[PDB]
Design a protein around this nucleic acid. Structure first.
Ligand SMILES: [Mn+2]
Ligand SMILES: [Mn+2]
Ligand SMILES: [Mn+2]
Ligand SMILES: [Mn+2]
Lengths: 136, 133
DNA sequence: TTAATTGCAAATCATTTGCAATTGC
DNA sequence: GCAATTGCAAATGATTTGCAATTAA
């Protein structure tokens, strides 16, 4: 009953409300990259005594505590995921909701070279691929 | 006529006074202005231009792939004339200024990752964030 | 000639905020 | 007890849209 993310709060000394418990639960069990509205929908599908604004506040708090990473894929709304322990980029299926995580060391290395050739130290990056399923 | 204006005449689009100016601006820019910034540039060359016209015009231009749009991480759409050759962006985190690069090796590798997963690449987005040495 | 565009304001959209009430530790 | 948190509801800030008058073509 004490979920992955719920524990992270306890260790950081954050007060654990009913609402924060279920948001933590929902986000703990989520495999994909939901937006704030999607979190609301799953949060209430577990307990209705939760307001739209506290999803927003909680999602923000979690982000501030490095419990969540935020992505602005372009589609207007902010989407969230539990902060991974290893870096990855994103492959968005333009034909469904499938989001595919991937790594490419060759790319990461090429990114570093480009910064260096340009007299920059690379301090971060955003990579997103957009795909359709192959048609031979 | 500007390059952009040439494109509207050829596309069949009505050229208005305001469109003539908004198109003059974005043909001349070599940076990545936001809508307010494009409005001020336009309001200057001819003050008889609404903000909504700017918003409408920039929407139109993008849909006609006359312009390209970007969200460089400042919660605000930025725009440029569609370049001849595709390029990605490196952003100076100290000044928010922007450098444009290309890299066939990355483009080739991107396609290969997509294929590796049962996909064909149809668009991508690559930004680099850096501090100057 | 006549349908597209403009200017204005009000309306969306996602997100935040003031405040009175509510609740965990 | 009390300080922290919640829930409306009513501000946002950026972008759009409805309508009447205007204008390119
Ligand atoms: Mn990467
Ligand atoms: Mn991910
Ligand atoms: Mn590229
Ligand atoms: Mn550019």
């Amino acid at each position: 009953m004490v979920s992955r993310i719920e524990q992270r709060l306890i260790d950081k000394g954050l007060k654990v409300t009913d609402q924060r418990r279920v948001i933590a639960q929902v986000l703990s069990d989520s495999a994909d990259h939901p937006d704030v509205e999607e979190v609301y929908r799953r949060a209430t599908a577990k307990d209705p005594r939760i307001s739209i604004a506290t999803v927003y506040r909680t999602v923000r708090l979690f982000e501030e505590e490095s419990i969540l990473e935020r992505h602005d894929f372009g589609d207007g709304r902010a989407r969230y995921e539990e902060a991974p322990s290893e870096h990855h980029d994103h492959l968005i299926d333009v034909n469904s909701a499938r989001v595919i995580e991937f790594t490419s060391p060759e790319i990461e290395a090429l990114q570093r070279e480009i910064a260096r050739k340009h007299g920059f130290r690379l301090v971060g990056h955003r990579l997103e691929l957009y795909g359709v399923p192959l048609t031979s």
